[PDB]
Write a protein that binds this DNA or RNA. Structure first.
Ligand SMILES: [Ag+]
Ligand SMILES: [Ag+]
Lengths: 130, 130
DNA sequence: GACCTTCCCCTTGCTGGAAGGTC
DNA sequence: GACCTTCCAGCAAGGGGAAGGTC
């Protein structure tokens, strides 16, 4: 298969695919006498994994490490679980963080008469003036 | 005041401050016969607002627009509230999104015996193979 | 005109570095 | 020696469109 073929089956863009290849994150596909990248089923799996890892919040470096595990048949299914559970934690800390913001913001907008007067305790609050 | 002074009072770095200035986001401070930026209280407010808007999830463009409002005394305290309430929504959509991920991930790690065997239904699941 | 390739710039929100001019 | 001023370079994670192959 060629790249646009793989693109559409995986939901990745072409540029994305080249980019992962460039970054050492996936196995390079063979070229053809014309240089067109030429993919096999394996590459498909690698890329799909990559994309699916991304959608579920792994970053590239980590998505890559998941791919290095896909390619090790002596892997421990545990070293993944661990990885996967950190990512849950991290996702958890990040949700805490956004709630604090939700909170801080909601406080500010209660106090705002939002009435077309120009005193705006949001602004006043956001800058330490007054 | 000079930049490091303003830096430390606001919690911004110097490079950050120059950068906001460069980007049109804050008022430029006067220079001195030697070119050192030289800040007034106003600039302090502007930058503090900027930083505080950022910590509570506004991006630069939006933080900037809040600053353009701080500098308009004919502003409506309402045009802010609106802005502030969008940012809550957006923060809300973003939390939905991270929960879906938490979910998807948690599913995957239940099923993983995490036992040092090499079948890893996480991987298997993440790539459409098997 | 339909893809394929490499090339580097645009982004967002900064942070670090190295030259040079003050303090 | 530690301030400041400028620009060079780059992190994620790719996008945009050049300039060319070649079927
Ligand atoms: Ag208000
Ligand atoms: Ag597993």
């Amino acid at each position: 298969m060629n790249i646009s073929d793989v693109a559409k089956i995986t939901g990745l863009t072409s540029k994305a695919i080249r980019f992962y290849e460039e970054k050492g994150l996936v196995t390079p596909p063979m070229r053809s006498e014309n240089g067109y990248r030429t993919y096999t089923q394996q590459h498909l799996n690698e890329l799909t994994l990559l994309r699916q890892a991304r959608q579920v919040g792994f970053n590239l470096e980590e998505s890559g490490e998941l791919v290095n595990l896909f390619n090790d048949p002596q892997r421990h299914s545990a070293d993944v679980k661990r990885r996967t559970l950190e990512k849950v934690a991290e996702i958890e800390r990040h949700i805490e963080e956004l709630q604090s913001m939700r909170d801080q913001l909601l406080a500010l907008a209660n106090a705002c008469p939002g009435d077309d007067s120009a005193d705006c305790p949001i602004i006043e609050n956001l800058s330490g003036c007054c």
